[model samples]
Target: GHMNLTELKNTPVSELITLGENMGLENLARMRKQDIIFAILKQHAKSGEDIFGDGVLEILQDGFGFLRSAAGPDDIYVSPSQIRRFNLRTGDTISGKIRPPKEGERYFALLKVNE
Candidate 1:
């Protein structure tokens, strides 16, 4: 069954962190390149200007630049605008990342990771 942050409260934070680490996501707590990008997109769409912190935006841009250089032009791009306009919700901070994607599903429209 899927669990929310409230549900996570009954579970152990240490255990959850261990699970993320075990599954190879040690930096789940701190802002990641993708999350930062999402933040930028959110801010940009909301205020018509980038509103995220400088360090965060810098890393996010750097990451995007690097990936763009390697990516094919045909590769779909997902902006923060797209996520917000479509009303996407990954969920609250801790409980969000741990949730699995739709079971046994496939979608060409999806990207494996955000950043």
Candidate 2:
């Protein structure tokens, strides 16, 4: 049976398609609620997994760098080696997954900086 539209209307079309592909559904963009729920369920199942976010690079003086949150808030710390690896510089906008801080820490670990 088709799923209720009310349950899916809140889903943006982009998210619906992304969720669909992640669940192995084809032609998902052309489908409606019946196909959408399965994708939503799978997306939920994969929740808490590594997800990427965007930020702007801010290189500090001592060979360290920070990815300033594009959405604003925390600044992720990027190691000197990692910065060299990406050839990143101040003012570069990047996207990547961030590692959470240790106890009482204010900075985050830059897991992967999107080139």
Candidate 3:
């Protein structure tokens, strides 16, 4: 499981795109080659066991944030306090753990700010 990262290094870009095709993570505009490759790594990780969260961070003017998750479909919510403590900027890649939301909330909550 852990070996895929280094094992994939020697693999060619043709098969890289090929692998992502068979396993998924179809090309999205603005996504880089390494981004696609690393995404495969994360996607495989997600398939196994970890309920981890990782993606491009989107911050609002009001300071609330959301992660446009790469490992899943829905965005994960980030509170203003979490942003303040982490001092994160817009479009940063924020990786964290998932904490299911309580009543009145929608998206998954970031358990801790893992900047």
What's the number of clashes in each of the models? 0, 0, 0
Per residue, candidate 2 scores C-alpha lDDT tens digits across 1-115 of: 1222223445677777776777676767777654564445435435555544456788888998877745223456789998888788889987776555556865546676662
Q: What digit string (tens of lDDT, one per residue) describes model 1 on residues 1-115?
A: 1322223334555555544556555454575433333332322334333111100111133222111211132122333553445444333111111111233622112232232
- Report the Cα lDDT for residue 82, model 2: 87
Colliding residue pairs in candidate 2 = none
Which 10-residue window of candidate 2 scores lowest in summed lDDT? 1-10
**Alpha carbon lDDT at 12, candidate 2:** 74
lDDT (10s digit) by residue, model 3, range 2-102: 32332454577777787787886677334655566566756665554435556688888888988874433256788899888879888898877655445
C-alpha local distance difference test of each model: 0.30, 0.61, 0.65
Order by lDDT, highest first: 3, 2, 1
- Flag the better candidate by lDDT, 1 or 2: 2
Where does candidate 3 have its weakest 10-residue lDDT segment? 1-10
TM-score to native of every candidate shown: 0.22, 0.51, 0.51
Two-way lDDT contest, 2 vs 3, winner: 3
